[PDB]
Amino acid sequence: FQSGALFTDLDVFENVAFPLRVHTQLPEEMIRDIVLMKLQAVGLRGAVELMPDELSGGMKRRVALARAIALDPQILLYDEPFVGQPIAMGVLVRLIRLLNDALGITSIVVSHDLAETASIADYIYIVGDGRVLGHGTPDVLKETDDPRIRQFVKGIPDGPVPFHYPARDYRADLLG
Amino acid sequence: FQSGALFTDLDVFENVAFPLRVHTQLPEEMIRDIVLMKLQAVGLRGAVELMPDELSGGMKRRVALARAIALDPQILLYDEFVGQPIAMGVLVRLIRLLNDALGITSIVVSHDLAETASIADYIYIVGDGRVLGHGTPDVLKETDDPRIRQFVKGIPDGPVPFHYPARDYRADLLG
Amino acid sequence: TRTLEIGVGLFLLAGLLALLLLALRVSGLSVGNAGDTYKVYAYFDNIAGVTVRGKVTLAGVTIGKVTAVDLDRDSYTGRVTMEINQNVNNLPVDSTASILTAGLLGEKYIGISVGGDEDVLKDGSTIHDTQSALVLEDLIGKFLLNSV
Amino acid sequence: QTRTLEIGVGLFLLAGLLALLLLALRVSGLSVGNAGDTYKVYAYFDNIAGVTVRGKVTLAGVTIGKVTAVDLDRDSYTGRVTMEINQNVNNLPVDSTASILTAGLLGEKYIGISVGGDEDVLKDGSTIHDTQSALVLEDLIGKFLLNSVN
Amino acid sequence: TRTLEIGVGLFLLAGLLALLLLALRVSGLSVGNAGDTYKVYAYFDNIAGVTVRGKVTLAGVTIGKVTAVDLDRDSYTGRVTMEINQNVNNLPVDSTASILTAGLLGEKYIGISVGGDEDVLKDGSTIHDTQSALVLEDLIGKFLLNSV
Amino acid sequence: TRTLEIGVGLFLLAGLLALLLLALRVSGLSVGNAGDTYKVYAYFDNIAGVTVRGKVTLAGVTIGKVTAVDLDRDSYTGRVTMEINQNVNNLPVDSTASILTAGLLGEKYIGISVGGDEDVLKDGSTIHDTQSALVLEDLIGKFLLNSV
Amino acid sequence: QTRTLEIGVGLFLLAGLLALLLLALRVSGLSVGNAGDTYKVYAYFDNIAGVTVRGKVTLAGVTIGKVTAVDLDRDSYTGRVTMEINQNVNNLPVDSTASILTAGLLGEKYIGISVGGDEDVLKDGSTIHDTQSALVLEDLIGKFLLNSV
Amino acid sequence: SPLERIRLFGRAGLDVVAALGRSTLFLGHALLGRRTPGTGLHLLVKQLYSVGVLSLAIIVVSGLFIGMVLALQGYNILISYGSEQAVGQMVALTLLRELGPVVTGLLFAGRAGSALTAEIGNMKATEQLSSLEMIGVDPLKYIVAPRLWAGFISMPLLAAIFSVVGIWGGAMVAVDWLGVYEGSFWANMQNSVQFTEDVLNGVIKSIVFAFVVTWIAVYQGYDCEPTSEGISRATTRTVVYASLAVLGLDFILTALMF
Amino acid sequence: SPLERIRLFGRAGLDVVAALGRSTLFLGHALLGRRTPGTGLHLLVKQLYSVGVLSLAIIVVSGLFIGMVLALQGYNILISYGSEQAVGQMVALTLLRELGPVVTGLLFAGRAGSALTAEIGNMKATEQLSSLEMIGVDPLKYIVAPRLWAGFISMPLLAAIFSVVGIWGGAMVAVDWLGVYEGSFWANMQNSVQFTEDVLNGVIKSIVFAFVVTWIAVYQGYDCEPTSEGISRATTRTVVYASLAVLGLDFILTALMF
């Protein structure tokens, strides 16, 4: 999740170890090795000591990613993975791809930030007002000519989604 | 300010009108004209009725941009486009329209480097207490400053450490 | 999901108004708008512990309240006026009314003894004979200084 | 269809809570066996100054029952107190007398009973025959000072 | 809006009305309570239990309250100043003023016994004679040591 | 950690000790006083003012509390069962226990006398003779009507 | 050094809070309108069973002051009660006596003073000469029951 | 380490004083600093309805409940001592000099002390306050100043309403439920209240803690850390501190007038 | 419009009952639903620390203050009547049989009823709870279950500690400050307490409060809206409700046993 969703009452070590101690009864020494290698893979190995509020906002998400990749899931979902970044956002967008190509695990990056999504995405979707508004590879979705999707994939402030709000004519608005 | 920083006890109309009723004693019908034309400029003219929690996240920022541009300031700074594409597009278009049209100084302060450089004309970088260089977005793109080339690009590892200060991957893992 | 919403709203409004009215009826003593207790008068020489809203009684059992006491400006005595439970309507006129004391240290009530036997009452009339309340100072003056 | 279930459970517990906890009403103190069963009797007195309801009747100090009601009989202008008697204590003879006593010195005036001398006991719903009425400070001091000492 | 400026004012009034209820219908200072009352002096030999805001009475029923106790510098006696209700203004000068103990363990209240004289008062004048408040030590000294 | 477990345990013990203090010390319950005490029965003619958990004493000092009171279906007297501490076990059988009043207006406890020098006790047996608890009514009856 | 001024003001407020406790601050039996203008006096009694501190001393019922302390003089084995007297009352002669009374029947045992007669009054810090001590119930009932009746 | 724990303790100690002085400076700048342009009486009214009028159902229902409790309790304790007709003065002494204002300070520290710290503390996290100084309106005078005045002039009023409803509810359970003689309730009540030591006593005791209740409730919000958890920790610190400053200050205020 | 206001009022009225039933289902699924893998007694200990042990200084200091208030006050009122030894009995009876548990429910709804909803509502806003179901641990059993257990078995203990410290502080001000005879305090106290109607009475009244306080404090947080202001409104709703669930339920518990 964005903002990490880190268990506040647990330290970073027990935080990353939590998915282990749930589905698995492993020796507390073997569990530490699994937690340590994970925290290394995200770079947050040195902070195996801290509490999730003693961590900066950027690193709070990497330890949560390490908690996720614990137990070695085969798919893993990233909600708002790259919201508030630039160097922090770079390491995270590199990790979400490394974890995919290396571990061969399905990644579902779900963020409104289109640039970096399309950067790492391979089959990007668009969801709008209850229905999937098309989908495809990032380039085939770049010029699909769907007014809503061409309005989303680019800036284009005005389009199917109204730029102006539903009000009365401005001419008479201040006149009357 | 990011997230709108909208006065909750005031409705959108009185919200946008607040900077007017402070420095100025204008007729309550003249304040209405400025609030109405100021809210229409950001596109949030129809929601002159709502309360700031009845407004969506992205739309709430637009009303705040209107409250700011009330009184017609000559400079305006928008700390943190972030955590929102179609909305971000209208916002990044408005911060430029307000600049070229009104001729007002804009100080966009956001981490989202891409869109910043998109609208910025003289972009700065501030790090660990000191300004780490500055310049036009392209001259800052390849300044060869290790910290600034590490910031202006992804490059997870550089002057800012990717790894935390651990002890040893051989010792801590075995000891 | 809209017809029964206003229904529960009106149910709750009526319940709140019901609570308000069932609370209000405490003041304005809740025996309708008036009661059924007829008065009677009594003249004493000292009512030291017969402050308002005491208990009047016969044979120990409470008959009614003491409504008011007053220093009648002519005789410098005490006129006590007291309500009597209407069922209690058979005390003869010659009945006496003496200020007793609740147990040993309780508030002084007034107790009526049947006295004689004649015309009962008008229930709003006056009592004639009585024994006034005791005062500890006169008591000890009679006991110590006079007798012993 | 969740919200409907939630409202149903709210009504269920809410309806149950009011009956189980509120209504501040009649006693159900194990009315399945022996009830702490008590049968009333009457007692004619002459002055009942401090035998107010929620008092106690007793024999030789230990409680026998409580006073249920006091009444003024419109004929004799005397007091009739009706009280309860524990079912186990059911050997109180007739000529046994009642008398208003005081707990300690400033305690509530209870009704003690002294055993009489005949065989037949009661129907537990009859009345008592003879008694000693309650004393009052005024009559006490009147008989003390004015007659005996003076 | 005005839906609040009325709500706010409504309860700003409700709280002040609650304050007035506490000051008037919970404590009873002056709304029709004790009002025009005129002072009277009294010289006693001992006022051991006579406190401020007591009760001065006649025939048991209250006449007013006592206002101030003082030790006169000349005769070392207790001068009390007490309020007497206006409706009661027929107390003769020769009348006596004793200190009676309320009930058996109550507060010491001043009680006036009518002597009977044509002249009444000035309501601002003093009383002539009295009977001082009793003290248990001298009482039992006269009882045990002196009498028997 | 372990300091969290230590603190949780410490203050869990503190609360339970406070509960046992409110029970044993503040209320004066059985457990501390119960210990090892041996029962004794006693026949009285009137137990007017002795209650459960009422002290039983000798020469003024407490030896235990009374446990229960009974109205015997046979002799119409009061059978009180009372505990007695084990250490005090030299009370003879011919001892006379009576009902005394603590101070002047305190609860009526039971104080026992010295019963000569015959067989001591069974600590579960019954006492033979006594002096019943006094009552105000018979007291003033014998005092005023008969003597004076 | 903003923190310094903040701590300074916090200490200034803590100081007033310390003096806000007012645990027996002023010491008297009445308000300061009358003031503390009182001077001591001593009294030798034989039995002061109920003259606990912060009581009252009076004349003719109206209070004069409050007792300050009770002491046991190790020489004559009696009680010495030291008390205060309001300054406006400065006319109690030496030959006058003090005696422990009781407010009503179950009140606190105050001490009254009976004025005799003599020109010289006091020095307000001297000691009384005679008294009548406080009677206990036991000596009273012993004198009553066994002796007279 | 122990040398670390004691340093942290002393830091927390000195910081508690630093905050207690910063709060005094804040109250000063709020109550008598200047007159900013955005002020008025409309703010005080808008804050008077959110600090008092919204807190009206809680304290009224609570006063009714605590009154029917004090009467329903003291009657049971008074039924053994014969002072039966003295239960009226009880629900008007044990509810008008010490428990009335104290329980009102406990419910006003809880509702309008926690709803005033999470409302003035959430304005600091969303930069609602910082966006005021940059407009030019001193937030201490536009935001904090009205809340300070709507706490000062509402908690004594709420305490008076609390005492009134508690007395009346105690009547409604003594008279209508427990059957004590009606008129004696109010009679025995009003002859022994001694206004200057019951009514005015409790009212000054309510002004005192009530002022403290809305000073350490509007400061803890203003000096929280701007985050969703800093606000939630401040809205708990302001209940703890405003319950201590109700109870202990009631001890300090009752030691002066018993 | 009026037809709009009444519709909104009826919607809130039905919504309240919907929430009252959802809370019951939540308490059911929390207390006796299943046994998820992440549970244990370590959770209950960690909670017992934050809920009770952290709430120990507040209620202890408050009990001391309320005891030296009760005694310092009743001594003043009882001296007038003439009864003075019994201040130890009167001070203990009010605190142990009623005010003790009530004030403990008011301070435990304030400290550990707000720091409970805030802690479990921030757990909802930051998706700390949603990230538990997707791990596979039922948050009602791993997060809510220990918090409810910590409240049930800590608020009665805190109330007992409150009563003990209040009694002892009342002694320390009656005896050492007001000079009443030392031994009479505890003597007159323990002869007229009647454990089954004062100690066990107050203890059941405190248990009943804990179940209704720690459940409307753990639900208010679980069913807040996930935002920095939804949490701050829930941590106020849980103080209001848990004060109304303390006072009102104390009126219903004291009607049962005077």
Ligand SMILES: CCCCCCCCCCCCCCCC(=O)OC[C@H](COP(=O)(O)O)OC(=O)CCCCCCCCCCCCCCC
């Ligand atoms: C010469 C200078 C000496 C310094 C004097 C400073 C003393 C005041 C502060 C007390 C210590 C607080 C430590 C904080 C504890 C902690 O861990 O810190 C815990 C909390 C705050 O930290 P959290 O973030 O953990 O909540 O601190 C508190 O609870 C603050 C305590 C407030 C008490 C101060 C006011 C009391 C006034 C009464 C004084 C009169 C005494 C009467 C007895 C005779």
Ligand SMILES: CCCCCCCCCCCCCCCC(=O)OC[C@H](COP(=O)(O)O)OC(=O)CCCCCCCCCCCCCCC
């Ligand atoms: C017989 C039924 C039992 C009676 C009591 C039941 C207990 C629960 C009801 C108490 C009221 C709950 C309000 C909670 C506070 C709150 O929401 O907090 C205060 C809120 C503020 O609203 P916000 O959510 O906008 O901040 O005010 C309201 O809008 C609440 C409106 C409710 C008004 C009803 C209560 C008024 C008087 C109470 C009854 C009178 C008693 C006399 C009758 C004999």
Ligand SMILES: CCCCCCCCCCCCCCCC(=O)OC[C@H](COP(=O)(O)O)OC(=O)CCCCCCCCCCCCCCC
């Ligand atoms: C024998 C034992 C007796 C001891 C009695 C001690 C009583 C002490 C009084 C308790 C008060 C505790 C305050 C808690 C505040 C706190 O912790 O203070 C700490 C907090 C800040 O702490 P943080 O660092 O945790 O944020 O302070 C504030 O936020 C501001 C509160 C300031 C208000 C202080 C109260 C002073 C009242 C003065 C007015 C008096 C008027 C009277 C005139 C008649």
Ligand SMILES: CCCCCCCCCCCCCCCC(=O)OC[C@H](COP(=O)(O)O)OC(=O)CCCCCCCCCCCCCCC
């Ligand atoms: C033993 C089982 C335990 C179950 C419950 C035990 C007893 C608990 C009693 C609940 C007390 C309710 C007070 C709530 C006050 C409140 O929330 O008051 C505060 C709320 C706040 O509103 P919001 O929900 O918008 O925040 O105020 C309102 O909603 C306005 C008035 C609503 C009051 C509705 C009352 C419902 C009572 C049920 C009766 C309806 C019958 C339905 C028939 C169709």
Ligand SMILES: CCCCCCCCCCCCCCCC(=O)OC[C@H](COP(=O)(O)O)OC(=O)CCCCCCCCCCCCCCC
């Ligand atoms: C000895 C018997 C055992 C006792 C058992 C305890 C009973 C349990 C009662 C459960 C209480 C309900 C909890 C609801 C859960 C929740 O979070 O409830 C939350 C919801 C509110 O929903 P929102 O989130 O929409 O505001 O409901 C409430 O607001 C509950 C308020 C509780 C108020 C309690 C009042 C009870 C007192 C009534 C007295 C009336 C007397 C009137 C006479 C004049």
